[PDB]
Symmetry: D2
Subunit: 331 residues, 4 copies
């Protein structure tokens, strides 16, 4: 007898199961950039959002909601309570402290391990079967922390790790060479940030090995100084942060990418972080970035890059370093 | 080892159960345009094809698989045997006889009624929970035939109905008004074909009603002959068939559109073909195009349109053509 | 024998003129949301950003470039100098004066006037053939200021206007109705903000007027009370500002939809802000929101809606006050 | 009194020269597949079709137009007369003689030479400033012919080449490895068809060279017989034509991708067919596939792959044949 009723004759009794649901935890700069790129790539049929800052949270949800006319994600929901979160296929954690200008990512660790103690039990409790994508820094360490607190088998705990570093290196390499990044190939592995490993042997355009063409590639004999390029990758979070206070867009895009392979079962290979005890020389429970095949069940295989001898020693030190820190943590 | 086994180290016992599968039954002109459109709107993580022509079936599948670098649908499969169809969310039927130049859609009924006797029982054996979308002609009778045989509740059996009629209309309108079809509104309802009803009362640009502006919209004594725009719509199939032999591009797009609403659960309203017994002054169980809310459980609500005496008149006549041709059926 | 030349043989000397370039002026939350939305829709082959805050603007530029791999817009540039802006088809202004509390809303305007008296001449100098889209508030006055300063003909100076109020209206409408905003229609015309006009007669789903079904619509004694909806719509950004301190996402999505019409030449109707002396019984040089055909040459036609005469008055009385302000400005 | 003028107030008139136009010459299976793929990737604001069969042509145009509601290319036109082609940025040539009953090769080549002596002058006469993409077979010779009849600079005359060959190879590479083709790289170079060169040295996943991991790769004595894979790629059309009667989909998807790099100015590397006298030791006016930087001005740069003595041998040889057939053509 309502207006609505004179107009829509109903015929089917309404229950709901979201069929392709993503959750972003943390709606700060990174969480919101991840949100917008997911919405614009149509990866979900439900997006849920949680954060402890209630007003910001509800303010961001409405901003996004008022743009539904222009999206094809028919449902956007939010809450402090994880129930809004239930049955997500994918949950992205972007919650936590971030670097002040000058600050290392490692100084972040104690603050964000506490945050994780609280979040991860609540996520795995409403979405027992999700894939977890970890973005908060220091990301390898925090990926491990998510792994341990949750109980999940390890194909299902994923860290973004060097996906960003690698995307920045390919951006700088095309810019040097004058070719789109889509066409410059090249892998940054190991730890996100200070001590990632640039794998010079597999850099190429059109299958054309750059280091075979130019044997000094990335040493100190290099007159054309391709170390400065990795160095520029290393130093970019600091340079962006110093300029605009934080980084948001590049990681949002890079995270939407990772979700795409998850939601569409693509099986593309990404430099992401995973639990690699048993491989690359490593015996501790550490997360580092290595090329991983990513699809609807998380990481199911790992490509076995052929590393030089120092390159495997770079990796082993990071494994040593990460574990010394982890030894000390408490769950 | 194998090359593969030296390159990729496996971590996760593969075990594939499909998440967003679409199946297309009939790989003729319409089936294949649906396939390329669905593939290009990224709506499936898996596409299955069936047909009775083995060679044809497998050359179409191979041809699709080869453009696969430029797609984001990781698995394309086909088979004469319907087990390649198992667990599809949406099965689309585009199998059977089409019109020769000059020929009525309803003249194809008998040949295709028989084809559906073979086809439908096989679909619902492999995909018992699926939504069926019928494209084959006469699409309204065949929708009813798919529903009786299959035994599915009515929400789950959808005729592409007047979705294409409405979209030709909007196109011819915008052409006359100088404005994109996206911005010209107006509905064709009833039978997909000779007895579709133009709802002149609801045509508009921007909320401004066209028959109010110009009262002889839709009668024969109108100086600028707007009635030949619905003349043009019904004659559409017969003109294009006469020129290129069949129609393909427009149905595929139209079909991928409805496919989009279903897989993403948009809940848009389309003029599609549903069992409207009990609604719209109609007491027999026939299918015909009416505005329908379309989501992941199929059709859930119908919009009640205010039709005149005449508009309301044609429908039950549209509705009885199809009637008289229906309970007279051996299946 | 540097490395770029060892690998790549150059066959052509590159006098790059960009073909579908877009500029965004101001890189605050709003402008950086038009930017990422434009970038995600593959509308431009080059994106220029300008702003007087140098570091912020450089940091936002690199944050975007860093995500190049994931975008299809090969060149992003930035500077204080509008020469980076050269050759744009479309220029989007989101810049304006920090807000001056307890101060007349005519010092305020006249201050923006002062920003525009620098901005507008520079944009038009480097992009003579471009199209300006004004978003900065107060949008109708400032659109007027840009028309004045630039000297452009009126079809090429567009205010974002009620574009977003109406997306908001259709969101809240669908929500009350249980249907995608894509399928609800409804127009909010006039002055962006407190003084806008919900056109009740044009509100429909599937061509069925809601005013006619339930003819008390939008009334005070409309027990079923849809002025709520319109009030929500005007209260809309105070509430969001109150919660997150600004609004961005929905304006960026909204502006990116206008950009798409203009860039692809669609000729869809949007409720935007155009100079409409001569129409709607407005005799002053005033920008009001009306339904406009928008395409590659700006706004080329206007849809003449039939207003109730109280609707008319709101509009006339709007122009009266806008003009009372514009007339006191020094230019 | 006209309905159009009671509704729309016109604000400006008819300086209409399209900005991002594309023409497809030839509306057989391939022509139409390039057309649908271009339409669904939104790369043009106008699409024109040409062909000598007038009915088919008209009829395909119309089929497409009825699809407008679901597309965003507001304008589709067609005719036997090349004036509909005026102002194209890209012209795509898919027309040619139907092959015959094993007549000579001169004899196949020259009969398209004769079709091209009509088609090319007409295209350039109306779009003097365009890029030409030739897709017709034999493609490397018919690209030369097109370059020759047209007088264009060689950056602006491009052949399809081994683009689809490489695509098919990566697909098959991917099927063996369990990874999406997007993540498998390898390059088929030289002359299209059986004389093509699979460049074994640069095949890889995540930068790890298959060659170094697997020594006997692309050798006959190869236990795994990866060589049989380049065999499949070169046999692929014979086998697809043998099954379904012709090939369409994969080729049109692959041409739409070249189109995008051209229209969006991406400067990605594709293996396409180019005039390379002066590179790879080539001697005569001849077209061979080579990795090529593709943008808004055609091919501007070329990648120098390090080929084996034997591999240069295959390329230099093709160059000799190409030239032997060419030096006798009649123009
Ligand atoms: N892995 C990578 O490549 C990158 C990582 N990051 C990291 O992302 C993390 C977040 O960064 P931003 O968004 O820039 O900072 P931000 O400060 O804007 O947002 C942090 C958000 O998380 C929220 N939060 C804090 N405790 C919470 C809890 N218990 N539950 C829910 N929400 C909580 C805060 O309320 C705030 O809204 C930082 O750790 C930053 O280091 C940033 C960029 C790149
Ligand atoms: N609803 C609509 O608005 C439209 C409907 N159509 C209809 O679509 C139908 C298909 O037409 P086209 O695609 O042009 O025909 P087509 O003849 O090119 O292809 C039809 C395919 O049906 C297959 N087929 C026949 N029996 C089969 C079975 N038991 N299982 C699997 N496949 C079987 C054939 O082998 C053939 O490949 C026709 O009835 C035509 O009228 C066409 C355009 C629009
Ligand atoms: N009409 C609409 O729907 C809406 C309009 N807006 C308008 O958009 C504008 C942007 O809002 P926010 O981005 O939230 O503000 P914001 O203050 O964070 O940044 C505005 C940007 O303009 C820059 N700017 C100031 N003067 C400039 C100059 N002379 N040249 C170049 N850049 C200059 C500032 O430095 C600042 O980065 C506001 O004026 C607001 O009124 C905002 C929301 C909605
Ligand atoms: N090399 C490559 O990478 C590939 C090339 N191709 C080529 O593309 C075409 C594929 O064949 P189909 O799609 O079956 O097309 P088709 O050759 O069967 O039809 C194209 C149209 O050209 C028309 N035509 C003939 N002369 C004309 C003229 N003077 N002006 C305008 N139109 C004219 C014909 O009437 C015909 O419909 C073939 O010629 C083939 O060589 C096809 C696949 C791959």
């Amino acid at each position: 007898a309502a207006l609505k009723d004179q107009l829509i004759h109903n015929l089917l009794k309404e229950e709901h199961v979201p069929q392709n649901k993503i959750t972003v935890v943390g709606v700060g700069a990174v969480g919101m950039a991840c949100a917008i790129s997911i919405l614009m790539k149509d990866l979900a049929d439900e997006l849920a959002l949680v954060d402890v800052m209630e007003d910001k949270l509800k303010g961001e949800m409405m901003d996004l909601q008022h743009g539904s006319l222009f999206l094809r994600t028919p449902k956007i929901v939010s809450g402090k309570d994880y129930s809004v979160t239930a049955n997500s296929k994918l949950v992205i954690i972007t919650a936590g402290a971030r670097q002040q200008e000058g600050e290392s990512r490692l100084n972040l660790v104690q603050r964000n391990v506490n945050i994780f103690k609280f979040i991860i039990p609540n996520v795995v409790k409403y979405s027992p079967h999700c894939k977890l994508l970890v973005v908060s820094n220091p990301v390898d360490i925090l990926t491990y922390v998510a792994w341990k607190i949750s109980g999940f088998p390890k194909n299902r705990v994923i860290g973004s790790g060097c996906n960003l570093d690698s995307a920045r290196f390919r951006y700088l390499m095309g810019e040097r060479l004058g070719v789109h990044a889509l066409s410059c190939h090249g892998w940054i592995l190991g730890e996100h940030g200070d001590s990632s490993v640039p794998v010079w042997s597999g850099m190429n355009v059109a299958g054309v090995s750059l280091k075979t063409l130019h044997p000094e590639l990335g040493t100190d004999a290099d007159k054309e100084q391709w170390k400065q390029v990795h160095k520029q990758v290393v130093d970019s979070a600091y340079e962006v942060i110093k300029l605009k206070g934080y980084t948001t867009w590049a990681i949002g895009l890079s995270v939407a990418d990772l979700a795409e392979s998850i939601m569409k079962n693509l099986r593309r290979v990404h430099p992401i972080s995973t639990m690699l005890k048993g491989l690359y020389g490593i015996k501790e429970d550490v997360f580092l970035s290595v090329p991983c095949v990513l699809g609807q069940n998380g990481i199911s295989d790992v490509v076995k890059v052929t590393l030089t001898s120092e390159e495997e020693a770079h990796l082993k030190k990071s494994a040593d370093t990460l574990w010394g820190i982890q030894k000390e943590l408490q769950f």
